[PDB]
Design a protein around this ligand. Structure first.
Ligand code: 4SS
Ligand code: 4SS
Length: 84
């Protein structure tokens, strides 16, 4: 139920995929990031689970060049780095 306030860069990213809010549940953040990954085609066509964000704003925000979507605890850390 927790509402979080994204830092400026993550907030702009969320707004790029149609987010209209100031604060978000972690669920909404994950949905919007998933939409971002889909729209920017940061997932690989052939390779399961891996998101390639090295060329992308997302990579700048997360501080990694790639990650697996299976690693939920790591994903939470990467997002929380970008929350107030
Ligand atoms: C209540 C809503 O919850 C979630 C929604 C979404 C995800 C995880 C969630 O919750 C778990 C933390 C993840 C995802 C992973 C990491 C981030 Cl940086 C962003 C989004 N995703 C997603 C993105 C890419 C790929 C290849 C599979 C995905 O998703 C199936 C998948 N996820 N894990 N295995 N398969 C979404 O499109 C939305
Ligand atoms: C109550 C919160 O729980 C946890 C949170 C986190 C982790 C483990 C947890 O609990 C298990 C010990 C682990 C991690 C591993 C060891 C330590 Cl020395 C520090 C952090 N991690 C994490 C860090 C780096 C990498 C490359 C992957 C990670 O994570 C994979 C991963 N594991 N599960 N999903 N993704 C986190 O970013 C947060």
């Amino acid at each position: 139920e927790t509402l979080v306030r994204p830092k400026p860069e993550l907030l702009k990213l969320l707004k790029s995929v149609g987010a209209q809010k100031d604060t978000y549940t972690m669920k909404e953040v994950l949905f919007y990031l998933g939409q971002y990954i889909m729209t920017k085609r940061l997932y690989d066509e052939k390779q399961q689970h891996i998101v390639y964000c090295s060329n992308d704003l997302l990579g700048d925000l997360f501080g990694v060049p790639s990650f697996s979507v299976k690693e939920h605890r790591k994903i939470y850390t990467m997002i929380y780095r970008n929350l107030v």
